[PDB]
Structure 1
Amino acid sequence: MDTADIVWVEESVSAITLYAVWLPPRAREYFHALVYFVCRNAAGEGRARFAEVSVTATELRDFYGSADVSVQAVVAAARAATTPAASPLEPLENPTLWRALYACVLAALERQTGPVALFAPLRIGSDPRTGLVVKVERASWGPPAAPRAALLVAEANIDIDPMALAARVAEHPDARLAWARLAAIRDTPQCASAASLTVNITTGTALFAREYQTLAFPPIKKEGAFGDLVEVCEVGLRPRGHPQRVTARVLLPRDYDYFVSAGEKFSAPALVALFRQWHTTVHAAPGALAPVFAFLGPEFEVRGGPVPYFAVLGFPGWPTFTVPATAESARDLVRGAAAAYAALLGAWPAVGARVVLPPRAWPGVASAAAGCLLPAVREAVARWHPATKIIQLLDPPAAVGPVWTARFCFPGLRAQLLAALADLGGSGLADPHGRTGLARLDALVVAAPSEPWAGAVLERLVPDTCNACPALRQLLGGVMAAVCLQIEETASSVKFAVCGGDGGAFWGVFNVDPQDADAASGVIEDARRAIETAVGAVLRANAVRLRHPLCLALEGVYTHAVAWSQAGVWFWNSRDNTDHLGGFPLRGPAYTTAAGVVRDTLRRVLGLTTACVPEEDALTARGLMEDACDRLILDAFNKRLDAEYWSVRVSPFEASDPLPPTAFRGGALLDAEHYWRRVVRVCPGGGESVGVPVDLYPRPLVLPPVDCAHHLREILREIELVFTGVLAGVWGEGGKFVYPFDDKMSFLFA
């Protein structure tokens, strides 16, 4: 604490990692952790610095989200992870424990030492006698060193008995195959030592190539030196929680800050095996402490995750970004990944929603925010239910003919409202140090309009936050309902009539002569301005301070609209031929052709309606729809032999065909299944109609005839939904639209 011996250095921090987690001499209420920073100077020079933090059981329980966690379990898991030769997949037991551990350690480090940011200039003050970083301040010593990347390509051949994978899958009916592979590798770690590996690392200064026939034997093909990528450093420390002096051995990268691996084929087991071999080799000579060996990803959960990532919490010490390939926009993808890593401190997506606030602190903030606002708003919030209708709208099937329609939108309203309401509830925060998460959220919200990566981060983060605290759902719903009520009240006076939407996005009709676009474009802008001003005033009157100012955006202007359900709607502009279709399922490459066909047919029918005719018009529309369906089915015959075109995507929360026993022999192909499973349907006999997981087999595939009749019926159901809605709305017809498939077209596939 004494400032007479602190040595201050200007530097930048490239990554923060977890090194050791130990229980102090006699302490059953808290534990100590040793965090490791890989700092860099103004010209570029790796240095290794260490800080020590103390985490109590209360913070661990708060970040965990429950009360079934103990410091003893955390210490046991951390000590087990220190030996990857026997337990290389410790976070696979309880991923939430490690997420809570990382969040707690990061928060404690941020609060005790000071404001820590990655890739930003800082002044670090360390104690010469202890060797530990004691203070961090934010300064400005010019342009900090620019981050440097290093391309990585790892390919491993791990063999696991398909019987074990089948048994594990049978244990969990909805488990993903990547998790099954990881669990099987966990059960017998010796399978990772006998695998064959190939690693290629390309930095801006050197190259590193290795080919191991067996990971336990010397490489057969070698290029470059391990002393060129990373430098091994030994440091001495005297933590206050350690009775005697200790030593730490670390890997400092040279000429790079993080690894970047494309998305062509990323396998977690290959990287895990490579890093495990590195850990075994480096931490063999006695004398120092062994760092924890933990990783996280979407494959460490039974049901997977929708976003692929790879989080390093310990060894080696630097992050690894997985970026999908074959995009011409790969560079912007990598830039966005780096920006997200720097902005959110590297916790997201690993920790999850804990990067904002601990999951056991949301109820207090939500209650405090609800206590504020206005009486009517509070009554609306308390009564909110997901099935209540706030403002009266059009009832499908409906159709608005020649009018001046207009789609409006508030881009990012839920995120802005959450940021504003968390600030309102901040008085309910137990301590003023939780403000850092809300500041991070505010930065994300501010940067979202101009940075797409921030928009994606928020779109994935807000639902997680709502899931964490079910009391946030009602708080957001009530405010959205108030916003919709104000929107309706204001629009009732600018020649507007709202016909749909939920409050963040809506559309409506205008009361204006439908022939003068020049005079019609001047009313839409006035209505937009008035609506934006009214919504802003209503939000301000409730003390809700929107950090980023509101902005209503006109998404389009049309002349015809047809609604066939509560979510599906078709807008058409009869002067420019532009149109918009919403609510049509797209779960495969064959659902895009159907969408195009539907849009073209609807364009033709609604253009025919302009000429105008009696019910004869409805008959003509029916004929056109039947013709369109016929042509679609006829064109679908030339793609009868393609299996990836007819394959449909399935989520982990639906009923799917049982996995054929031959799908577990794929090998490295099962390491890429974490959320979606593509299944095609084939007919090997009379009426078998079995299902085939397309992506679990090597190519090319040898399959029986595809079951295009079943797939075409599934698509035709959706097509007929839209066509029936259009017929019922535009011409008032009770007669549903049905297409005879089994009578006129089923022969092409039988």
Structure 2
Amino acid sequence: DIVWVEESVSAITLYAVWLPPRAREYFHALVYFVCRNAAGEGRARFAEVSVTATELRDFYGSADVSVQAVVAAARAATTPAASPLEPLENPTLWRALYACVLAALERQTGPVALFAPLRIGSDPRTGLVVKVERASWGPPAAPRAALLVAEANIDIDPMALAARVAEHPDARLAWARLAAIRDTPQCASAASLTVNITTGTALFAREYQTLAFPPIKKEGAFGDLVEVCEVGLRPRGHPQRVTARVLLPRDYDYFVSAGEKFSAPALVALFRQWHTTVHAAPGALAPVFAFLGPEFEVRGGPVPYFAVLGFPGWPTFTVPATAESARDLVRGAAAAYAALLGAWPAVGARVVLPPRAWPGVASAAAGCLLPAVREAVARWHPATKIIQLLDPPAAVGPVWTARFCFPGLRAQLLAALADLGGSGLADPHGRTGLARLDALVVAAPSEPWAGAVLERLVPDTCNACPALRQLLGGVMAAVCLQIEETASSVKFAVCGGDGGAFWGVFNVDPQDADAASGVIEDARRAIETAVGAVLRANAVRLRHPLCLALEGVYTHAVAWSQAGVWFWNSRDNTDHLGGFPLRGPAYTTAAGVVRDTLRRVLGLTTACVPEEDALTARGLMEDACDRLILDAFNKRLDAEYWSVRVSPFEASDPLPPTAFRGGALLDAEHYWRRVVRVCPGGGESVGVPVDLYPRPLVLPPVDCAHHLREILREIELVFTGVLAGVWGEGGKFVYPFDDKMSFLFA
């Protein structure tokens, strides 16, 4: 006799993480379900889980973490006024915590799925969800949203940022700010924070000079957005009746924040104020104040996100810029939330499998393969490329060339190998995380939102399990071997590539095009079929049937380095350049100059002795360099144009002591540091972090005698490759920048 309802779960958040009595190595966690029934009406629900120590150490990847540490972190996060920003101590701890609580939720209660129909039960005697089941009836309500804008001037003292950056050098400045709030929470009490959440029913806007103080401008009310709900619960951990206050999000479902100037400290401060306001009255339990994002780690992260691990229980999606297709990225964020249960991108690679169950699956996948690939996996050394390719100083043409790619081969191969090791998993029900990856791979061609997930879930998974790299690159090595074997039969000739993407030539007469399409299509058919046959023979089965993409037909192709290739189809003048670093806005203009110079220099096929062509080519390359440096002068004062994106891994210029004064601008720095080298006074070249100063900027003249030298360096690399690849070798194209056209800037 269990109650039964019909609802869709819109979010799953963490309320309490406690250690029951007579307990040493298992902690209970209460989960808040934001359920909404048909037509949008929302009733709040709760469930309980029980995570053991072993599961925690599995999702952490190490035994350093303990149940006591997790419970202490949760207790610290119980109060945001005393100490917010709890995850910043051990971000991996909270990452693993959310991973295991979601896994236990899936295991004990049953299958859960956001924004999807779900039959839900409850036990009144205790008062929590007991079992969740996938339903098959109902046109569920649309996942409504609310647009949030929040800006705060948290008066952080610059010297503290400088000191904390001195302790850890390559600390992304958002982490420096966030650590400053963490070490002095009173700073989050005084800030000119402004908030404007617009919904489809009623708007809400508030303005503060000091956060704790009453607003200096009101609009709507807190009650229009929130329906504060007091729910009684009797967990197995708590025998006494425990009451919980939750902020049911009426009208909307999730938040949509612009990622252009998103400040994680701003939302942290606003949510801390809301937490204090709602849980000020006692007689009820307090929730977990936990948030994660790329700003929460020293070295930062690629993809902007803002996790909501606890209070208020509403997912908030940062959609960076992309104004033209704002709806597209909002839908992509919503789909990423719904599919991977909202763990992505906060939990990390643990959405699929625990970081420590992978060492078993990889071993269990090295056994079900064929005998040859079994060794091929074991002999994989970084960048082996055991396949007949071209010497990197070389070029081809005029012959019919073609580029091919298998869309999402690493992700599809990882999915097949995960299934091969699936039998080796401890729990058959613990393979639901292995159902999200297949959902991603299946929906990858249909919708690009799965794409960006798979281009980051896979490389990060390969870092979670180092042993998976030698497996994936062995399977791909086997794929390349059969590509080469089948190539000879269809006149295709492997000339270069990087595995899933490969470009080659055809031994057809280089003048006929009517039959060219036929051979170019038969080669695709045969290579695709043969690779699929090898994969099937290797037992690895792909969910989405394999497909080869004809990414372009070209007549000339020139390669200089291992990644640098330029293709050009003379008939339609369609070209493609790869391997040129786009490390700024000037490198794009350099790439365009290179792709025009190469188009003009391979148009010199007029009958001539090879020696003549080398000189009439070098002259044109020098002229192209001239026209580039001439146009460089007309943009000498655009410092943002002469900017380079330094990674937190690369060696970086030292931060000026005045860049620590950007206010609500230091938060934007999550991954890249955009630096411009200016030349104050004389002789000395100093770096300016462009995005840490207010605009319009005032600077000494930009040292174009440094950036143009590097741009020219890579241009001469490409030009030396083409000069020594089409005609006779022996010529390193150098442009005398220091003499011919140095005067313009220095």
Q: Is the 8 A contact 2:304 2:320 kept in 1?
A: no
The change in CA–CA distance for 1:502 and 1:642 in structure 2 (over 3 A counts) is closer
CA positional deviation for 1:618: 1.2
CA positional deviation for 1:610: 4.1
Aligned to 1:359: 355
CA positional deviation for 1:43: 1.6
Which of 138, 143, 146 matches 1:147? 143
Q: Is the 8 A contact 1:19 1:34 kept in 2?
A: yes
CA positional deviation for 1:326: 5.0
SS in 1 for 2:55: helix
Q: Equivalents in 2 of 1:27, 1:192: separation in Å?
A: 37
SS in 1 for 2:688: strand
Aligned to 2:399: 403
Q: Is the 8 A contact 2:308 2:316 kept in 1?
A: yes
CA positional deviation for 1:45: 1.1
Note the alpha carbon deviations across 1:298-323, whole angstroms, 9 max, x for none: 01100100111000011111110111
Q: Equivalents in 1 of 2:121, 2:687: separation in Å?
A: 63
Note the alpha carbon deviations across 1:260-300, whole angstroms, 9 max, x for none: 11123110111111111111111111110011111100011
Aligned to 1:719: 715
SS in 1 for 2:633: coil
Q: Is the 8 A contact 1:25 1:243 kept in 2?
A: no
Aligned to 1:249: 245
Note the alpha carbon deviations across 1:601-659, whole angstroms, 9 max, x for none: 11111011244444111111111111111111111111111100101110001111111
Q: Equivalents in 1 of 2:667, 2:120: separation in Å?
A: 42
SS in 1 for 2:280: coil
Q: Is the 8 A contact 2:4 2:119 kept in 1?
A: yes
Aligned to 1:449: 445
Aligned to 1:569: 565
Aligned to 1:136: 132
Note the alpha carbon deviations across 1:118-176, whole angstroms, 9 max, x for none: 11111111011111110111112220111110111111111111110100000001101
1:690 pairs with 2:692:
no
Aligned to 1:547: 543
Q: Is the 8 A contact 2:165 2:171 kept in 1?
A: yes
SS in 1 for 2:243: strand
Q: How does 1:196-211 map to 2 (within 5 A)?
A: 196-211=192-207
Q: Equivalents in 2 of 1:653, 1:168: separation in Å?
A: 18
Q: Is the 8 A contact 2:610 2:727 kept in 1?
A: no
SS in 2 for 1:644: coil
The gaps in structure 1 that reach 5 residues or longer are none
Q: How does 1:262-661 map to 2 (within 5 A)?
A: 262-325=258-321, 327-661=323-657
CA positional deviation for 1:520: 1.4
Mean alpha-carbon deviation: is it higher for 426-435 or for 351-360? Answer: 426-435
SS in 1 for 2:515: helix
CA positional deviation for 1:389: 3.0
Note the alpha carbon deviations across 1:373-414, whole angstroms, 9 max, x for none: 111111111111114231111102111121111111111111
Q: Equivalents in 2 of 1:740, 1:132: separation in Å?
A: 76
Q: Equivalents in 1 of 2:229, 2:590: separation in Å?
A: 61
Note the alpha carbon deviations across 1:72-128, whole angstroms, 9 max, x for none: 111111011000001111101011000111010000011111111011111111011
Q: Equivalents in 1 of 2:333, 2:297: separation in Å?
A: 22
* Aligned-CA RMSD value: 0.9
SS in 2 for 1:513: coil
Note the alpha carbon deviations across 1:174-218, whole angstroms, 9 max, x for none: 101100000011111011111121111111111111111111111
Q: Is the 8 A contact 2:716 2:734 kept in 1?
A: yes
CA positional deviation for 1:490: 0.9
The change in CA–CA distance for 1:326 and 1:380 in structure 2 (over 3 A counts) is closer
Note the alpha carbon deviations across 1:31-55, whole angstroms, 9 max, x for none: 1111111111112211111111111
Q: Equivalents in 1 of 2:184, 2:170: separation in Å?
A: 23
Q: Is the 8 A contact 2:441 2:450 kept in 1?
A: yes
Q: Equivalents in 2 of 1:243, 1:305: separation in Å?
A: 43
Aligned to 1:671: 667
Q: Equivalents in 2 of 1:346, 1:552: separation in Å?
A: 32
Which of 119, 125, 130 matches 1:123? 119
Q: Equivalents in 2 of 1:192, 1:284: separation in Å?
A: 17
SS in 1 for 2:156: coil
SS in 2 for 1:296: coil
CA positional deviation for 1:327: 2.3
* Length, aligned pairs only: 746
1:171 pairs with 2:183:
no
1:218 pairs with 2:206:
no
TM-score by length of 2: 0.99
The change in CA–CA distance for 1:614 and 1:384 in structure 2 (over 3 A counts) is closer
Q: Equivalents in 1 of 2:388, 2:435: separation in Å?
A: 38
Q: Equivalents in 1 of 2:478, 2:137: separation in Å?
A: 48
Q: Is the 8 A contact 2:610 2:728 kept in 1?
A: no
Q: Equivalents in 1 of 2:16, 2:249: separation in Å?
A: 20
The change in CA–CA distance for 1:681 and 1:111 in structure 2 (over 3 A counts) is same
Q: Equivalents in 1 of 2:608, 2:339: separation in Å?
A: 58
Mean alpha-carbon deviation: is it higher for 34-43 or for 351-360? Answer: 34-43
Q: Equivalents in 1 of 2:682, 2:324: separation in Å?
A: 46
SS in 1 for 2:504: strand
Note the alpha carbon deviations across 1:314-366, whole angstroms, 9 max, x for none: 11111101112352000000001001100100001010000000001001111
CA positional deviation for 1:542: 1.3
Note the alpha carbon deviations across 1:525-544, whole angstroms, 9 max, x for none: 11111111111111111111
Q: Is the 8 A contact 2:127 2:234 kept in 1?
A: yes
SS in 2 for 1:712: helix
Q: Is the 8 A contact 1:652 1:675 kept in 2?
A: yes
Q: Equivalents in 2 of 1:343, 1:567: separation in Å?
A: 34
The change in CA–CA distance for 1:399 and 1:610 in structure 2 (over 3 A counts) is farther
Q: Equivalents in 2 of 1:729, 1:392: separation in Å?
A: 18
CA positional deviation for 1:502: 2.7
Q: Is the 8 A contact 1:10 1:141 kept in 2?
A: no
Q: Is the 8 A contact 2:177 2:666 kept in 1?
A: yes
CA positional deviation for 1:501: 1.4
Give the ranges of 4+ consecutive aligned residues of structure 1 lying more than 3 Å apart after TM superposition.
Answer: 610-614
The gaps in structure 2 that reach 5 residues or longer are none
SS in 2 for 1:196: coil
Q: Equivalents in 1 of 2:529, 2:190: separation in Å?
A: 67
Q: Equivalents in 2 of 1:494, 1:253: separation in Å?
A: 61
Q: Is the 8 A contact 1:343 1:440 kept in 2?
A: yes
CA positional deviation for 1:24: 0.8
Mean alpha-carbon deviation: is it higher for 458-467 or for 430-439? Answer: 430-439
Note the alpha carbon deviations across 1:402-453, whole angstroms, 9 max, x for none: 1111111111111000000100111110121221011110010000011101
Q: Equivalents in 1 of 2:638, 2:114: separation in Å?
A: 48
Sequence identity (%): 100
Q: Is the 8 A contact 1:484 1:502 kept in 2?
A: no
Q: Equivalents in 2 of 1:632, 1:534: separation in Å?
A: 47
SS in 1 for 2:218: strand
Q: Equivalents in 2 of 1:146, 1:274: separation in Å?
A: 27
Q: Equivalents in 2 of 1:289, 1:543: separation in Å?
A: 52
Q: Equivalents in 1 of 2:195, 2:526: separation in Å?
A: 61
Q: Equivalents in 2 of 1:461, 1:522: separation in Å?
A: 38
SS in 1 for 2:193: strand
Q: Is the 8 A contact 2:16 2:29 kept in 1?
A: yes
Note the alpha carbon deviations across 1:214-257, whole angstroms, 9 max, x for none: 11111111111111110111111111111311111111111100
Mean alpha-carbon deviation: is it higher for 495-504 or for 16-25? Answer: 495-504
Q: Equivalents in 2 of 1:569, 1:509: separation in Å?
A: 14
Q: Equivalents in 1 of 2:697, 2:558: separation in Å?
A: 43
